[PDB]
Amino acid sequence: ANTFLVKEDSKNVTAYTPFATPITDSKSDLVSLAQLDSSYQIADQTIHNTNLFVLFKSRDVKVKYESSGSNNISFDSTSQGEKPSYVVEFTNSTNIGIKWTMVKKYQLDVPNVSSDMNQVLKNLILEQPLTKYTLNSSLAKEKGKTQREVHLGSGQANQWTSQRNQHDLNNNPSPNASTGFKLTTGNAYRKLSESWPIYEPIDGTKQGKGKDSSGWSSTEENEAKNDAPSVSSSGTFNKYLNTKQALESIGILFDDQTPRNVITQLYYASTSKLAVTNNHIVVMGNSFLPSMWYWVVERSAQENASNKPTWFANTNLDWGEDKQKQFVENQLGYKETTSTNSHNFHSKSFTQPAYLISGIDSVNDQIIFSGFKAGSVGYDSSSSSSSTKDQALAWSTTTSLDSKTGYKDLVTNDTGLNGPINGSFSIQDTFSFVVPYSGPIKTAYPVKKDQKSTVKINSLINATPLNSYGDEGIGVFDALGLNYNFKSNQERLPSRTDQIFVYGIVSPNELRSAKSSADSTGSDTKVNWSNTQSRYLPVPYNYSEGIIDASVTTFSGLKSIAPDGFANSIANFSVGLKAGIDPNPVMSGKKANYGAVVLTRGGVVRLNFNPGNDSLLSTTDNNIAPISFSFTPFTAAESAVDLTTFKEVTYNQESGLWSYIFDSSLKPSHDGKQTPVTDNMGFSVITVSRTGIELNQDQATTTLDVAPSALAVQSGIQSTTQTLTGVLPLSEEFSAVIAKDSDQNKIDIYKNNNGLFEIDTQLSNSVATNNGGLAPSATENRVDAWGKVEFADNSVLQARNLVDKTVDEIINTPEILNSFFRFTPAFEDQKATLVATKQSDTSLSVSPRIQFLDGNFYDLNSTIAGVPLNIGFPSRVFAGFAALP
């Protein structure tokens, strides 16, 4: 309401005016007001139809996972552990100022676990989280057994061409195709009840213990602690990085120096973002850790009700085509009638179990989400004569070279559907990591028929959008998108399991099946979200250096030159999904346009919807890539932005521009080498605008065959020296920045000069000079924030023979009273008008109504939140007008 809510700290939210001044007594400790203890903090907030909705989470929360019995996931009741997250609706109880009062409180309870779910959860293993300091070599993992080794075994090599038909690998030209990566070295994989370490291997191909938590606690932890000690000492850092502070910064909870169990980290990370509709409150995880569930809270929920989350494993998405969904599901694990204790997500008929969510928003009563599919594959946990013992089962699903050029054809290509196929291929003198061809060429799951029942294939979840970490050449090409065909127009061959971006628009009824699925007793109930899609989105290949063509470049040897705050250049990331209604009007009879934008590594993604039926935007040609998704690359200025410092994203309906705010105080205190971080000062603002031909503009634009796009611009609003308080996007032409250059708040005004914001030092000084009041002062002789007003002398009446005219006439003739002053604007097109009041039968007084940086007009009677601004404009009485006509 011409007010800007600024989160001052973890508990307080203050209301600000367009003049970058706080409304007196508006500062509210929303934690105290929500009747929550001091361990709670604001995770997210949103306004919905005049009321504020706040998502709160506690630094004290402790969650337990017990493999035995029912109700497996539970808060640890002993001591201060049962501290669930809450969504609170607040209303403004006053008409003069801000007095927030609590309306509704919603508890976000732990998930229900069905019998089938617990069978997967008992041996579920999750990778340690990726930090700012995780290296490409840290993510690299030892290559697994080849296809020949798994199905045929140790004997000979030449018998492949003859024995492939018996193992259902008809015409497979890849006996030496990797079946996955080893879990005896590398990043730590921990059960829900176990804890991740503060140490990250420098070379995951040699250091780390993977899933061997016994070996970690018995011999390797001592080795990591002496090489990479926490600061107080000064260590070597030859084999490991100590990322404790970088973990604390991404929301990892600790007991002194020890991170709490995986299930607690998952819970606390999962209550990070909210979106509100007329009927629901939806809560999703952060873009740092994979989330396995989300909440759909019915706003009609009775006070003190435990609101249950819905599992992603039970939420079936539309991945574009059924083959795209088949690809993901087949690589989740081994599905066999004969299993015994071999339970995985594919085995128990579940779908994709986790995502790294970019964020959530709502346009109309629809929920919008995006995120990357978290890598999830099967692993062999059997112990003893097993070929794949302690090996994750992952493989490249990149399209073969012979595939037809056309989106549908490229993504439905059967290459790597059931098992491994890609690796290394040399056709005459030209090389490729991808098969050149697709009876038929068969693919089979990497488990041999003999050990069908005597194998234990359980489920793992990776920290990144990568399925396969195996230290080979295809992984780098799949991770960075360097697989192209050798055809006329060179087309990028997509993976269907690595770096898979996901998005959609979810209807109130789809949210209702989700709530029903959360509350389901006994067996699992499934939800179907049908207005969703997926897209292969690799990281830019130019965030890496010195890659080999036709010795290959692998993760363990890949040089990162990434400028966006990550030490790795292989794993994709997204942040700040924000929806926005387009202010540009559509042709009559059509519904107002809307879209959403999200930032990923190396560019901005634009999400397109059809407002007529709140569906994804589409085109009749299946060859054309779904026009619901557009990607636009960043230039060097936007790429330089540390994406891990993302503070908030706002949209302004008047301009149709998204403002992504980055705060450098969000950087961890210390390095992976325990060195203090010195560039923790400043902030940055990226502006996103729509580009391209938009739907329903005219009769030709009722159909689209080209995806509307967006453009991110590191638009000149930034500092390396100031501590940000907040950015106020006043208008397309101006933004106000409140920052501390010491301990005291200062106001800076940035002017948009043909697409580029630059500080206006004279405007900043004018707007900051408010004498402790709510608005900039209006000086008689100065061209300040309110321009400069010069009134005519009383002789103006006798000059233009207005003495014959009555006060009533003059007042009811706008063109006349604008000749009573001269207005000098402070900025171009700043307008002013005079407001007249009859003072007597022969005299009137005039007072200016002047436009501020926000484009609105202000006068003597202007208010913000019902509070009179008392700007202090001059008044002028003119006397000598006729009493009667």
Binding region for K ion (CB under 5 A): 779, 782, 784, 788
CB of 419 within 8 A of CB of 393? no
Nearest to 811 by CA among 839, 783, 850, 791: 839
* C-beta of 492 vs 782, nearer to K ion: 782
CB of 764 to K ion, least distance (A): 16
CB of 767 within 8 A of CB of 736? yes
* 543 three-class SS: helix
Classify residue 541 by its DSSP letter: G
Cα R_g (the chain), whole angstroms = 31
* C-beta of 638 vs 784, nearer to K ion: 784
* C-beta of 805 vs 876, nearer to K ion: 876
For residue 370, give Cα distances in angstroms to 358, 359, 533, 820: 6, 6, 9, 57
259 HSE (CA, 13 A, CB side): 29
* C-beta of 524 vs 784, nearer to K ion: 784
State how far the Cα of 725 lies from the Cα of 683, in Å rounded to an integer.
10
Q: Is 669 exposed, middle or buried (0-12, 13-18, 19+ CB in 10 A)?
A: middle
State how far the Cα of 253 lies from the Cα of 262, in Å rounded to an integer.
10
* C-beta of 361 vs 784, nearer to K ion: 784
State how far the Cα of 70 lies from the Cα of 286, in Å rounded to an integer.
28
State how far the Cα of 23 lies from the Cα of 150, in Å rounded to an integer.
70
* C-beta of 624 vs 792, nearer to K ion: 792
**Which residue is nearest to K ion, using beta carbons?**
784
CB of 636 to K ion, least distance (A): 41
CB of 16 within 8 A of CB of 728? yes
* C-beta of 227 vs 784, nearer to K ion: 784
Sign of CA dihedral 373, 375, 377, 381: negative
* C-beta of 235 vs 825, nearer to K ion: 825
- Residue owning tokens 């630059």: 758
* 609 three-class SS: strand
Nearest to 458 by CA among 552, 388, 528, 362: 388
- Residue owning tokens 């966006």: 564
Nearest to 260 by CA among 269, 224, 211, 37: 269
* 70 three-class SS: coil
CB of 779 to K ion, least distance (A): 5
Structure tokens at 687: 């502006």
* C-beta of 224 vs 826, nearer to K ion: 826
CB of 774 to K ion, least distance (A): 17
CB of 200 within 8 A of CB of 241? yes
CB of 778 to K ion, least distance (A): 5
CB of 469 within 8 A of CB of 130? no
CB of 875 to K ion, least distance (A): 14
Nearest to 458 by CA among 345, 352, 292: 345
CB of 374 within 8 A of CB of 588? no
CB of 766 to K ion, least distance (A): 9
* C-beta of 472 vs 784, nearer to K ion: 784
State residue 725 phi and psi, 5-degree precision: -105, -45
CB of 782 to K ion, least distance (A): 5
* C-beta of 326 vs 769, nearer to K ion: 769
State how far the Cα of 809 lies from the Cα of 532, in Å rounded to an integer.
63
* C-beta of 404 vs 782, nearer to K ion: 782
CB of 250 within 8 A of CB of 285? no
* C-beta of 789 vs 802, nearer to K ion: 789
CB of 144 within 8 A of CB of 391? yes
